[PDB]
């Protein structure tokens, strides 16, 4: 149908139909009379998977022959979403499969909806790892993603009576056709025990053993025949009254059972620590095995890079030291040099509650030898600090890996900086914040370590896959090369006055909105005006992200309409979605507030179809692929200094929405790329937030001086949005008035004014679309191909390549 | 190579090689450079599995079109063993696959050894169900085996310091290529809750739900293109703080986690009761669904037969009543008629400790509605008894389903008899014992219900598969038809004086013994004389089976040699193997005694290679396939009246061993078929045991009057076989002298004398072999094809067929 989806060659289509029928018969053991839509999905998945296999085997043997430096991306989260369409896109099989399935009397898009998301992440950090794997494969890097194969991923969210309920995400229930179990590469992981000091050195003994069984998933590059591996570990009990002993195997296997559902919040639970060590211990043995199968560990950093995704895999540092010192018998100083040159650390947030600080008593019991190694690292590190800054005793305590207090804790971020040759933030403003505030001491000691690597998103999933209509009209003008060279979108600036292109851009958006409006009615029986401005905020629910600020604007619009009902206003559909961590009460109250506002606004006859408020249930990767292409306005409204980067922001920019946002995270760079005239910027800058903190934030001041704000708070308190439970939102009001860390009231006036300017521009379709074209055209910097190329050249010391392997 | 293994056609071999390479590449994602022997096994298994699929689909659609009466064999155990070779044998693919793999540079027998046993049974009862599935498919019956897919089967036995250690049988670790998950047929099973009585009847409410997910395994008939299904249920939690809630899903899923390892012993544990209801509830819903997809339940017994394998699935009776009365709204009397005509019950033992008697308080809590239905059944049943035998109040209490006492219990055997139209024992003597003793009251009320169905074994697995050499020399004389018509072996009687046949029979045995003697040295580094008489007792370790009587003989032989070292004796290798239930102390002591005797006997220089005692570790189906063909003497020495049938006995008879045995179980019929002159019969008959019980068994009498026996007991007590632990076997001696339920001493003299006659005959190879030929020739009755044909005609009301479906 459309060119960017590839060729539907007669032979290809014939062969796909044949192999589809083969799998339906031999693999699924079905015939067309009893086959369910799910059977058809699986037959297609197996058919597409067959085309990966040759390339996968050839890629891995190519790496063995050439022996390039290997990149190991360690993460507790990989938010992959669905795999079928992505694989077709990267293998240029989409049109052929569409044709093949059409000839068999099937609708391929219907089959695609059957696939479960691989929801092995919480949000942005997990999704970044997924985009990164795609870009590493597309750039021909010998890269491996290493993580945990959670039996249960991020919970499915149901909304009951306006409240979030959590349901287990049993994503493996029907099987996963993409993974290949590799039980032959099973490795032991040790826990507990004690340290014995001998003549030959330290020995870690009397441990409990859990087995780590790997499952490999292929990661195809974009039309380059490279297929890399994501290896995820699953916990298995070793095979050594009777019934209870067998049942108790569950205890060991619980390590890989479930993803911790906390976004930007540290929970110091033992099971989480076990997960972190489990992935690190299994992965490092695998790395070392692969390295030896190429004694001389001097060359280890030349053949191995380990990227630590946040501090979650920080135990890699002392584990690598443990193996090199206790098992390989290297001297400490040599082992340390190898470790530092091998490891690099990426920080993803400065929120204090997100920082991992593990109680010493936990490490003492679970990982006694690692604790010893951490103390040794700390002593040697602090000796360097003392030598560089003689007499500065407070710096010593500020920089220590060990935090003193009620309970002693290890600061894992400090461990990561000490043990890595490179430390990066994920957007320019964030990386500057790291050097100026939380890691200032470390920057002063080792400034060469500190870098920036601004985040990105893969344009395969986030344009070609989710928005083929837009990909096509772009390709019609500038060709297909931009899909793996997103900077080429700049060429679209010469079409900003092109009447045909303006018309096409606007038509594609309208089509996307109609499709999404239909999806809502079918799957959720809710009716929306497709001619309204689609105002979308989708991301995890958190105070710092300020869904509450959005809520205040929505209530402002509602109150203004009620005050002057017969005055024209630009119709809006305000869509908010995202999951709250199960134990985060305020986030759950925010979800309830949004639905409560919807209940009032959506049933007020005077409002009509001029304002609608919808809570998008179960926001996840597959839903992002639907809603983002349909959005007109992207809400990126975190308090300045809190969103390290954001990546949702980049997705909306690429898909033809305009952005209303603070100068926070990557928004700063997005505005810089597009021009501030083409961005709806409002609110405090970081410096303004600092000034307010110095004199003290008093929310009452804003309440006292802004009558429209006062009205809203009075409505909330009095039970306007909760008639039968008048005090339901008192916690929200109390927080806003007395304990608001994120200064919601301080940005309210500028936000509302800025939103009026959004409405003004939307009334002029042509100028709206021209500004959109200016955004899409300057979105190139935010390709994860650019991000990964920078990691490769500036941290890993390897050169990317766009050359293809033989098919 | 040999004809009974089928044709190796050039096209077949070419196609098998092609599909093998296809699976290695696409299914296993390997190439020949990195492929492990296990990968090669899986490639072959998938290749052979492909040939089942068409036949499997066609068989099931054939049953749908013809709508024959369906047979449902309900069992908690299916001891399947390995599947690869069996499938090849039944599809006539063995030689073709051997050729194909040979041309690829692989040894097929080596690949076969990689497959794990499906050890979903304890021993004889579980293996009977497996043989029965094979025969039902071979006889073209529309039959389904229904059970539980245990994650862990019968434990792997290791011997450490002469003691049994148990290891978890993680049989699914590398995957099971034979099964197909059918998540679309998942069914809810209910537990706990309470009964509510309404105007519309009883309602079972507030239950906890566990999901039952079926996995289907194909069961191929012998070269008839029939492929039936064994459906095994796996327990799954439904999808509805957070972390602990997810982890607690394990509790529901524990139902299908592990096989209870008790052989002939009832353990009244709640988890076991849950397993029993789980299989029954899921299976009956599946049966009813299939029945409705052909309201009028009058025809239910014409289209459905349910065979209860022991009392383990006895809850089928009240569950069927529950569904018919509570859900389908049939009146009680009609529901009962349907239930009785649908259900039939097979009793497998009379040992009192094996009988299921469930505490009422357990049923009350777990299955409150079933308890109510059981009481109602009991009241109506006892009203019939009272009417038939007026005034006989003791009969009423003897026949009650409810047993009074300290704890009230339900007698599940009584429930089964009341609710079934047919009750059978498993050998003629056993069925007579049922009518004369334990179910005498029931027989008097309903004599028409009571039947015999003498057990059998499948000659596919137990001759063609495990002993191709013997199958071939038989086929050379009388053709191949005997493999599905075992009565044709009678034709071998006309070769009993044929010098060539005598030579061939003896050569095949010698070859089997050499092969097994080699297996011992390779896998267990133990050296045995292959010219010795192979004296084998393999079966679960139990007092009633009297491994101890064997031990007494072995020590007698040893003492006689030590007394007259330079006298000639027929050399023997005495092999004993089998598992003990983990909580059965005496059985574990027996294993320790056997190894302790071996330690002394095997290292005594004066004995030399004249006597060896070996404990066969980890006795299981795959080991039975090796040792049984190598055996000369089969030990079947249970106390008369205790072994309901035995089936190991039949396996040895078919494979050219002579039998030393009591007149117990099927031994009686085996002796009857072969002639008592061709059997080594010894010991008390049932009537003799009864006489001894009447006057009281005094073991001291035998100790006092048999000096050879006295010496052995003195050796045991004094520490001759345990120097460093002199009193190790005091429990054994104490039991033998004072608390021996199985009268070991009473059969000692006759056993030893009988064993002397065995040795005498073995010294005359020609006459030994002629007697062997007379056994093999009369083994036809003990084909499970004969057994199943009798079930079909006399219980299920269906006609077997040897006609083949189209290929
Ligand atoms: N636990 C986190 N989750 C995120 O999304 C974080 O990482 C993302 C990827 O770098 C960033 O874009 C987000 O700003 C940050 O909150 S940190
Ligand atoms: N729990 C049991 N295990 C058996 O082997 C039993 O059933 C077999 C099959 O009918 C019989 O051959 C055995 O004699 C009997 O012990 S009963
Ligand atoms: C991109 C993405 C995120 C991150 O969005 P932000 O707005 O940057 O927080 C979260 N969840 C999903 C499902 C995503 O696709
Ligand atoms: C046949 C068989 C049995 C039953 O043997 P008996 O001697 O009848 O108790 C037990 N275990 C296995 C593995 C078998 O193959």
Domain match, B567 and B691 both: yes
Q: How far A515 CA lies from chain B's nearest CA (Å)?
A: 30
**Residue B732, CA atoms < 13 Å, CB-side half-sphere:** 30
Give the active site residues of A. Answer: 348, 539-540, 545, 647, 651
Write the residue in A167, A174, A254 that is nearest to B240 by C-beta. Answer: A167
Q: Residue A63: which H helix or E strand, with range?
A: helix A37-66
The experimental technique used to determine this model is X-ray
∠ CA B85-B618-A187, nearest 5°, is: 85
Over A576-607, what HEC string results? EECCCCCCCHHHHHHHHHHHHHHHHHCCCCCC
Q: How far apart, in Å, are the Cα atoms of A224 and each of A137, B510, B695?
A: 9, 62, 91
CA–chain centroid gap for A9, Å, is 37
Domain match, A8 and A133 both: yes
- Contacts of residue A448, Cβ cutoff 8 Å, sequence gap at least 6: none
CA dist., res. A461 & res. A452, Å (int): 24
Please give the span between the terminal C-alpha atoms of chain B, in angstroms, as a whole number. Answer: 25
Specify the ligand 1 atom closest to the Cα of A346: 10
Binding residues of A for AMP: 31, 64, 289-294
CA dist., res. A581 & res. A123, Å (int): 11
E strand spans, B206-254: 208-220, 227-236
Q: How far apart, in Å, are the Cα atoms of A460 and each of A116, A136, A478, A625, A634?
A: 19, 13, 17, 11, 20
Beta bridge partners of B236: B211
Domain match, B442 and B531 both: no
Answer whether A82 contacts ligand 3 (Cβ < 6 A). no
Å from CA of A586 to ligand 1 middle: 20
| Helix, strand and coil in chain B, % to nearest 5 | 55, 15, 30
∠ CA A613-A616-A617, nearest 5°, is: 135
Q: How far apart, in Å, are the Cα atoms of B658 and each of B295, B515, B549, B614?
A: 56, 20, 18, 20
Write the residue in B26, B50, B236 that is nearest to A53 by C-beta. Answer: B26
Q: Which residues of A touch B33 (CB under 8 A)?
A: 61
Closest C-alpha residue for ligand 3 atom 4? A124
Domain match, B129 and B197 both: yes
- Whether A170 contacts chain B with CB within 8 A: yes
- Whether A31 contacts chain B with CB within 8 A: yes
Of residues B35, B215, B214, the one with CA closest to residue B114: B35
Q: Cβ contact (<8 Å) for A254 and B243?
A: no
Specify the ligand 2 atom closest to the Cα of B430: 14
CA dist., res. A290 & res. A319, Å (int): 17
Answer whether A301 contacts ligand 3 (Cβ < 6 A). no
Q: How far apart, in Å, are the Cα atoms of A746 and each of A5, A535, A547, A663?
A: 48, 22, 15, 14
Q: Among A78, A123, A458, A539, which residue has the most ligand 1 atoms within 8 Å of its CB, making it the best to mutate?
A: A123
Residues 784-803 of B with CB under 8 A from A: none
Residues 518-537 of A with CB under 8 A from B: none
Of residues A722, A386, A748, the one with CA closest to residue A552: A748
Domain count of chain A?
2
Domain match, A181 and A69 both: yes
CA dist., res. B551 & res. B752, Å (int): 11
Please give the torsion angle defined by the CA atoms of residues B358, B363, B366 and B372, in that order, rounded to the nearest 10 degrees.
Answer: 150
CA dist., res. A489 & res. A654, Å (int): 10
Please give the torsion angle defined by the CA atoms of residues A381, A382, A384 and A390, in that order, rounded to the nearest 10 degrees.
Answer: 170
Q: Residue B753: exposed, middle, or buried by beta-carbon count in 10 A (0-12, 13-18, 19+)?
A: exposed
Report helix, strand or coil for B211. Answer: strand
Q: Which residue of B has its CA nearest to A60?
A: B30
CA dist., res. B756 & res. B745, Å (int): 18
DSSP string, B773-802: HHHHHT-GGGBHHHHHHHHIIIII------
Q: Which residues of A touch B260 (CB under 8 A)?
A: 243
Q: How far B420 CA lies from chain A's nearest CA (Å)?
A: 33
Beta bridge partners of B536: B575, B634
CB pairs under 8 A between A and B: 97
Q: Are B81 and B622 in contact (CB under 8 A)?
A: yes
Please give the torsion angle defined by the CA atoms of residues B416, B418, B419 and B421, in that order, rounded to the nearest 10 degrees.
Answer: 100
What sign does the dihedral A45-A578-A458-A506 (CA atoms) show?
positive
Please give the backbone phi and psi of residue B615, each rounded to the nearest 5 degrees, phi first: -90, 115
Residues 657-676 of B with CB under 8 A from A: none
Domain match, B181 and B327 both: yes
Domain match, B410 and B542 both: no
Q: Which letter does DSSP use for residue B189 in this model? A: E
Å from CA of A539 to ligand 3 middle: 5
Q: Cβ contact (<8 Å) for B57 and A31?
A: yes
- Please list the alpha-helical segments (H only) found in B293-324: 300-303, 316-322
What sign does the dihedral B255-B261-B264-B266 (CA atoms) show?
negative
Domain match, A389 and A534 both: no
- CATH number, position B661: 3.40.50.2000
Closest C-alpha residue for ligand 4 atom 8? B646
Place of tokens 């990691």: A791
Domain that holds residue B202: 1-456+784-807
- Contacts of residue A406, Cβ cutoff 8 Å, sequence gap at least 6: none
Write the residue in B156, B181, B271 that is nearest to A175 by C-beta. Answer: B181
Q: Are B540 and B519 in contact (CB under 8 A)?
A: no
Please give the backbone phi and psi of residue B186, each rounded to the nearest 5 degrees, phi first: -65, 135
CA–chain centroid gap for A750, Å, is 29
CB atoms within 10 A of CB A140: 23
Domain match, A790 and A764 both: no
- How many residues in chain B? 807
| Helix, strand and coil in chain A, % to nearest 5 | 55, 15, 30
Domain match, A531 and A664 both: yes
- Contacts of residue B293, Cβ cutoff 8 Å, sequence gap at least 6: none
CA dist., res. B306 & res. B162, Å (int): 44
Domain match, B359 and B474 both: no
Domain match, B16 and B151 both: yes
Q: Residue B718: exposed, middle, or buried by beta-carbon count in 10 A (0-12, 13-18, 19+)?
A: middle
Query: B554-589 as b/e, with b when 16 or more CB fall inside 10 Å?
Result: bbbbbeebeeeeeeeebbbbbbbbbbbbbebeebbb
CA–chain centroid gap for B211, Å, is 28
CB atoms within 10 A of CB A677: 9
- Contacts of residue A387, Cβ cutoff 8 Å, sequence gap at least 6: none
């Amino acid at each position: 149908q459309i060119s960017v989806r590839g060729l539907a060659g007669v032979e290809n289509v014939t062969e796909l139909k044949k192999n589809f029928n083969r799998h339906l018969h031999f693999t699924l053991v079905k015939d067309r009379n009893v086959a369910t839509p799910r059977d058809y999905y699986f037959a297609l998945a197996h058919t597409v998977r067959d085309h990966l296999v040759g390339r996968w085997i050839r890629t891995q043997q190519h790496y063995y022959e050439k022996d390039p430096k290997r990149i190991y991306y360690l993460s507790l989260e990989f938010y992959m979403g669905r795999t079928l369409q992505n694989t077709m896109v990267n293998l240029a099989l989409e049109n052929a499969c569409d044709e093949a399935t059409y000839q068999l009397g099937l609708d391929m898009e219907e089959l695609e909806e059957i696939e479960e998301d691989a929801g092995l992440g919480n949000g942005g950090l997990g999704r970044l790892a997924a985009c990164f794997l795609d870009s590493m494969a597309t750039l021909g890097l010998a890269a491996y993603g290493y993580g945990i194969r959670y039996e249960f991923g991020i919970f499915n969210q149901k909304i009951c009576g306006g409240w979030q309920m959590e349901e287990a995400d049993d994503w493996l229930r029907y099987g996963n056709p993409w993974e290949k179990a590799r039980p032959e590469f099973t490795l032991p992981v040790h826990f507990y025990g004690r340290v014995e000091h001998t003549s030959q050195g330290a020995k870690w003994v009397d441990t409990q053993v859990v087995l780590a069984m790997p499952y490999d998933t292929p990661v195809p590059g974009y039309r380059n025949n490279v297929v890399n591996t994501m290896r995820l570990w699953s916990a298995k009990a070793p095979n050594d009254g009777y019934i209870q002993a067998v049942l108790d195997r569950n205890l060991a296997e619980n390590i890989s059972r479930v993803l911790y559902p906390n976004d930007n919040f540290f929970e110091g639970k033992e099971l989480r620590l076990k997960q972190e060590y489990f992935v690190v211990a299994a992965t490092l043995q695998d790395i070392i095995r692969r390295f030896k199968s190429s004694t001389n560990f001097d060359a280890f950093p030349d053949k191995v890079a380990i990227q630590l995704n946040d501090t979650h895999p920080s135990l890699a540092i002392p584990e690598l030291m443990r193996v090199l010192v206790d098992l390989e018998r290297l001297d400490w100083d040599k082992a340390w040099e190898v470790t530092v040159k091998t490891c690099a650390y990426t920080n993803h947030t400065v929120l204090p509650e997100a920082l991992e600080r593990w109680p010493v008593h936990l490490l003492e019991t679970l990982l006694p030898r690692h604790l010893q190694i951490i103390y040794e690292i700390n002593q040697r590190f602090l000796n360097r600090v003392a030598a560089a800054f003689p007499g500065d005793v407070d710096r010593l305590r500020r920089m220590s890996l060990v935090e003193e207090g009620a309970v002693k804790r290890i600061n894992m971020a400090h461990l990561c900086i000490a043990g890595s040759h490179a430390v990066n933030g994920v957007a320019r403003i964030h990386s500057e914040i790291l050097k100026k505030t939380i890691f200032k001491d470390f920057y002063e000691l080792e400034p060469h370590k500190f870098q920036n690597k601004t985040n990105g998103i893969t344009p395969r999933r986030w344009l070609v896959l989710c928005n083929p209509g837009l990909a096509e009209i772009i390709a019609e003008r500038i060709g297909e090369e931009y899909i793996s060279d997103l900077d080429q979108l700049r060429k679209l600036l010469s079409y900003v006055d092109d009447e045909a292109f303006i018309r096409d851009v606007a038509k594609v958006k309208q089509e996307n909105k109609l499709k999404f409006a239909a999806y809502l009615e079918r799957e959720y029986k809710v009716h929306i005006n497709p001619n309204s401005l689609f105002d979308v905020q989708v991301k995890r629910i958190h105070e710092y992200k300020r869904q509450l600020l959005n809520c205040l604007h929505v209530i402002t619009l509602y109150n203004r309409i009620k005050k002057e009902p017969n005055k024209f206003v630009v119709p809006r559909t305000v869509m908010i979605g995202g999951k709250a961590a199960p134990g985060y009460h305020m986030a759950k109250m925010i979800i309830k507030l949004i639905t409560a506002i919807g209940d009032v606004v959506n049933h007020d006859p005077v409002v009509g179809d001029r304002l609608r408020v919808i809570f998008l249930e179960n926001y996840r990767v597959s839903l992002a692929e639907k809603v983002i292409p349909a959005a007109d306005l992207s809400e990126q409204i975190s308090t300045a200094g809190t969103e390290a980067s954001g990546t949702g922001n980049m997705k909306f920019m690429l898909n033809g929405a305009l952005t209303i946002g603070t100068m926070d995270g990557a928004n700063v760079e997005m505005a810089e790329e597009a021009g501030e005239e083409n961005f709806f910027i409002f609110g405090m800058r970081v410096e303004d937030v600092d000034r307010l903190d110095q004199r003290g934030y008093n929310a009452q001041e804003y309440y006292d001086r802004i009558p429209e704000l006062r009205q809203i708070i009075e409505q909330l308190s009095s039970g306007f949005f909760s008639p039968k439970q008048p005090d339901l939102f008192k916690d929200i009001v109390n927080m806003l008035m007395h304990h608001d860390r994120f200064k919601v009231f301080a940005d309210y006036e500028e936000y509302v004014k800025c939103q009026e300017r959004v409405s003004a521009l939307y009334k002029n379709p042509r100028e709206w679309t021209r500004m959109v074209i200016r955004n899409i055209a300057t979105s190139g910097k935010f390709s994860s191909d650019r991000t990964i190329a920078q990691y490769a050249r500036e941290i890993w010391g390897v050169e990317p390549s766009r050359q293809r392997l033989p098919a």
